Design an enzyme around this catalytic site. Sequence first.
Site, PDB file in Angstrom:
ATOM      1  N   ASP A   3      21.431 -82.373  89.087  1.00 46.64           N
ATOM      2  CA  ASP A   3      20.689 -82.553  88.084  1.00 46.64           C
ATOM      3  C   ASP A   3      20.391 -84.133  87.654  1.00 46.64           C
ATOM      4  O   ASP A   3      21.613 -84.766  86.914  1.00 46.64           O
ATOM      5  CB  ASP A   3      22.239 -82.466  87.546  1.00 46.64           C
ATOM      6  CG  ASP A   3      20.859 -81.545  85.813  1.00 46.64           C
ATOM      7  OD1 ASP A   3      20.122 -80.313  85.801  1.00 46.64           O
ATOM      8  OD2 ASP A   3      20.506 -82.632  84.882  1.00 46.64           O
ATOM      9  N   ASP A  11      22.391 -74.392  95.026  1.00 47.62           N
ATOM     10  CA  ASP A  11      21.824 -73.613  93.940  1.00 47.62           C
ATOM     11  C   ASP A  11      21.290 -72.577  93.977  1.00 47.62           C
ATOM     12  O   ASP A  11      20.097 -72.512  93.733  1.00 47.62           O
ATOM     13  CB  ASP A  11      20.988 -74.894  92.932  1.00 47.62           C
ATOM     14  CG  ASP A  11      21.559 -73.693  91.317  1.00 47.62           C
ATOM     15  OD1 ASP A  11      21.551 -72.713  91.564  1.00 47.62           O
ATOM     16  OD2 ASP A  11      20.791 -74.534  90.468  1.00 47.62           O
TER      17      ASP A  11
END
Length: 276
Positions: free
Chosen positions: A28, A168
């Site tokens: 992120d 993810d």
Amino acid sequence: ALYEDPPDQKTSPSGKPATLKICSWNVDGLRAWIKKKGLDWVKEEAPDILCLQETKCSENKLPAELQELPGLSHQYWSAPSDKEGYSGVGLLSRQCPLKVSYGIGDEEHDQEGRVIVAEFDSFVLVTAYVPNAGRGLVRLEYRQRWDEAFRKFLKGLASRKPLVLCGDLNVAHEEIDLRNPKGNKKNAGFTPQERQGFGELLQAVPLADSFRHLYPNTPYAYTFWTYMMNARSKNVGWRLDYFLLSHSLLPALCDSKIRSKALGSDHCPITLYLAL
DNA sequence: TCGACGGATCC
DNA sequence: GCTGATGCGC
DNA sequence: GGATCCGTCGATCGCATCAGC
Ligand SMILES: [Ca+2]
Ligand code: NA
């Protein structure tokens, strides 16, 4: 409740030692993550392969700290075509791969820098950052087209080598994989369509969910907690980051970990141990 | 995620 | 290099 | 006619863009 990931099993069901350590992490913000001491944690985990998702960083801006990385010498990156600062994946690996592909072979689903494919001798590693359905499900119908095309591509792949899918996947498969299931059945990552999508990926390729295979009734085991409302402190999170294994490699599985205590993102990193 | 908002329905 | 405002996220 | 009980509905933190000068 809270979770303590059990100790690392580095022997296989037949007692062969683990040869290969794949760590995967939705960072992120690669640049934010590196600044938040993220790479120190990677050096001490010492994987053979590091998979990064949502790098949010073009190749130009890729911080210097990564060239130094020496056990992760071969280094592969993909960022979207025209959306700067968005999505992005990486695949760093100690040994050098036989071949590296970007995308899944679908022009529609290959414009957002989401999948790297890496063929090693014994197997092929796909690392993916799957697209979120969106706030209010504005992308949920796109997500169903993604899930179906990604399934087809992965079925094709696994028919030729054993396949490790990591990263993810932007879905909590079952009501055990998130703390507040009944409140999120209309939210991105736990709609029936995303969950139905996952189960089809599991039965279609086919692939076993590495972590659940070993710990099929362990709850409160998550990979992501939202930054808001101190959610990680109360461990109010989701399991979003998987290793998905060809059934063939199940007897090579030593362990699948959740590294809950590694800070640096809104996802903790997961780690795979294979005897190969 | 967590709360304030209703607008419902129950003693 | 700064400010301030948007995009995108489970 | 008060008090709980329900599903909608905001702003919540973080990163990184962008418009503009
Ligand atoms: Ca948006
Ligand atoms: Na009265």
